């Protein structure tokens, strides 16, 4: 492939460099339309800018935490982090968010990796070996109330059991309702006068729930869960302007008030170098 062809002096009536940008086109002008060039080859394919590659590496999408401790006398397991949940969403963390929001609709399978590490902030004789249980409560499913409920039975709910310190991994098809995931949605659930606005109304795919299978030892053990997400088989439509201001909420476009100028002011003139 040639990156530049050889081109010499020109004295024409045919001027490729004068255009009318009002038309909305970006005319494909090249170095050889306005200087004299020599042949050179590309030596490159643009492999690593493919959208599959761009969205295809694992990104941290969520960090939660649960603890193993005596539940005796706990009136609210959920509240004691005897077990937590993550109401599946990819808008939490902004690193992967900005990347995704470069497009309007996106379609992909997900591969999740879940790393779990334990901490024992206060005096323990040892490090126990705990087994985590991650179960996906599809919307319209009995939500775990306790840490050893009947829900954890998950007889129809896909669940994975792995050891703390270890990692769990699996992949999920694209479980979108539509033909693709809406990165943006300028509409509402229904024609109400108070109903929410955005995608937060469209992206209601239940939540994930973690818990430690093991009973309690004499000390307490903090287990912190990190969920990583990798898109595989990516398809993206309609590019948009990149995010400039900071994010404030999962699912709304809102930016913070009295934010700071995002364009760097010159130290000098327009004329400055």
């Amino acid at each position: 492939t040639v990156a530049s062809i050889s081109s010499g002096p020109k004295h024409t009536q045919k001027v490729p460099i004068l255009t009318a940008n009002e038309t909305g086109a970006t005319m494909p002008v090249l170095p050889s339309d306005s200087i004299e060039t020599r042949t050179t080859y590309m030596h490159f394919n643009g492999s690593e800018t493919d959208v599959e590659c761009f969205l295809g590496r694992a990104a941290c999408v969520h960090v939660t935490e649960i603890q193993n401790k005596d539940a005796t006398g706990i009136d609210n397991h959920r509240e004691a982090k005897l077990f937590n949940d993550w109401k599946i969403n990819l808008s939490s963390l902004v690193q992967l968010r900005k990347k995704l929001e470069l497009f309007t609709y996106v379609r992909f399978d997900s591969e999740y990796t879940i790393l779990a590490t334990a901490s024992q902030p206060d005096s323990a004789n040892y490090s126990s070996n705990l087994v985590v249980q991650a179960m996906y409560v599809p919307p319209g499913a009995p939500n775990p109330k306790e840490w050893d409920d009947y829900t954890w039975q998950s007889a129809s709910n896909p669940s994975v059991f792995f050891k703390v310190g270890d990692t769990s991994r699996f992949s999920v098809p694209y479980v979108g309702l539509a033909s693709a995931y809406n990165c943006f949605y300028d509409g509402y659930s229904h024609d109400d006068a108070e109903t929410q606005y955005g995608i937060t109304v469209l992206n209601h795919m239940g939540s994930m729930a973690f818990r430690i299978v093991n009973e309690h030892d004499e000390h307490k053990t903090l287990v912190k869960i990190r969920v990583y997400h990798r898109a595989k088989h990516v398809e993206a439509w309609i590019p948009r302007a990149p995010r400039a201001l900071p994010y404030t909420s999962i699912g709304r476009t809102n930016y913070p008030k009295n934010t700071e100028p995002v364009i760097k002011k010159r130290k000098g003139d327009i004329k400055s170098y």
Binding site: P138, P139, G140, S156, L177, G206
Partner: protein, 59 residues
């Protein structure tokens, strides 16, 4: 107020004109539908799509 054979019966009144016999929304996973076999199976899945057949037999 307690489950009875009678909640399967939609009553009809002689001589009423223009009026309404019954009403329900179509949340097949809840409400009237929920205990029916259809309702009961739909509940093992997260998403549904398709046509429903609703019939009335007169007695």
């Amino acid at each position: 107020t307690k489950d009875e054979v009678n909640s399967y019966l939609i009553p009809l009144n002689a001589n009423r004109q223009n009026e309404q016999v019954f009403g329900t929304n179509l949340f097949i996973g809840d409400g009237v539908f929920k205990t029916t076999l259809l309702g009961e199976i739909v509940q093992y899945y997260t998403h549904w799509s398709g046509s429903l057949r609703f019939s009335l037999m007169y007695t």
